[PDB]
Amino acid sequence: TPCITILSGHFPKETIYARKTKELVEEYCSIHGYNFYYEESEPLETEEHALHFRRSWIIQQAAEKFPSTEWFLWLDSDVYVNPKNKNKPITSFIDLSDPNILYHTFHEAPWGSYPINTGVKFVHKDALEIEKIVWSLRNEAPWNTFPYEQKTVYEYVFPRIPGRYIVHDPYTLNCIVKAYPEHVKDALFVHMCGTSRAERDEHMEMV
Ligand SMILES: O=c1ccn([C@@H]2O[C@H](COP(=O)(O)OP(=O)(O)O)[C@@H](O)[C@H]2O)c(=O)[nH]1
Numbered sequence: 001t002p003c004i005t006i007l008s009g010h011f012p013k014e015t016i017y018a019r020k021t022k023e024l025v026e027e028y029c030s031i032h033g034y035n036f037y038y039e040e041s042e043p044l045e046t047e048e049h050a051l052h053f054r055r056s057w058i059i060q061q062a063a064e065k066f067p068s069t070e071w072f073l074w075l076d077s078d079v080y081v082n083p084k085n086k087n088k089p090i091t092s093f094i095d096l097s098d099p100n101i102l103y104h105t106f107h108e109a110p111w112g113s114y115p116i117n118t119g120v121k122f123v124h125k126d127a128l129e130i131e132k133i134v135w136s137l138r139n140e141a142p143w144n145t146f147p148y149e150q151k152t153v154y155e156y157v158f159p160r161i162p163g164r165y166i167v168h169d170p171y172t173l174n175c176i177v178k179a180y181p182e183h184v185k186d187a188l189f190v191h192m193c194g195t196s197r198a199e200r201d202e203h204m205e206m207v
């Protein structure tokens with residue numbers, strides 16, 4: 001059972017729904033003994049592409065706070081822990097036993113517009129330096145175009161690490177609410193992907 005550090009972050013901080021997912025994630029980490037890293041630093045770069053790339057920088061903050069981590073888990077600020085599954089461990093939903101694997105990722109077919117969705121991303125500690133390269137690419141075309149870091153993992157990173165990544169079904173660990181409404185109830189991680197700040201606020205009030 002590996003050492004897991006869950007990390008997240010959101011600019012601006014005082015956004016309501018981001019505070020609400022954070023607490024559900026913090027509670028989740030305390031139940032299972034996972035480390036929780038939440039970025040508190042305001043970003044030097046506030047442009048959309050830069051905020052989307054920021055996860056590649058926060059993982060390094062997480063790495064320095066929690067050096068013993070085996071797997072870093074990025075969850076978007078609009079991803080929360082399903083309260084019905086909050087007492088279930090991540091290792092009940094995914095097999096993290098193949099030592100050759102650097103990334104566990106998730107697809108969003110047939111409803112999504114990209115082959116992977118990096119709103120929930122598992123990064124092995126040995127891929128830390130790769131993530132540093134992903135961050136260093138934030139201002140270069142084409143990687144500074146939508147969909148940014150997600151495109152950079154799929155189109156830059158994955159071709160350079162053949163056989164060292166896995167794309168899983170998203171049903172329990174990256175369950176997009178609008179696309180898989182029927183799975184939401186048995187998901188661990190539920191993603192309010194591609195909705196507005198007010199829409200996400202309202203949804204989190206309901207949870
Ligand atoms: O206004 C924003 C939007 C983006 N993000 C960061 O970028 C990630 C992805 O944003 P979002 O979930 O809105 O993208 P989507 O899933 O909707 O494509 C979030 O976890 C945030 O850390 C942010 O800090 N502020």
Ligand SMILES: [Mn+2]
Pocket residue numbers: 076077078079119191192193194
């Ligand atoms: Mn998201």
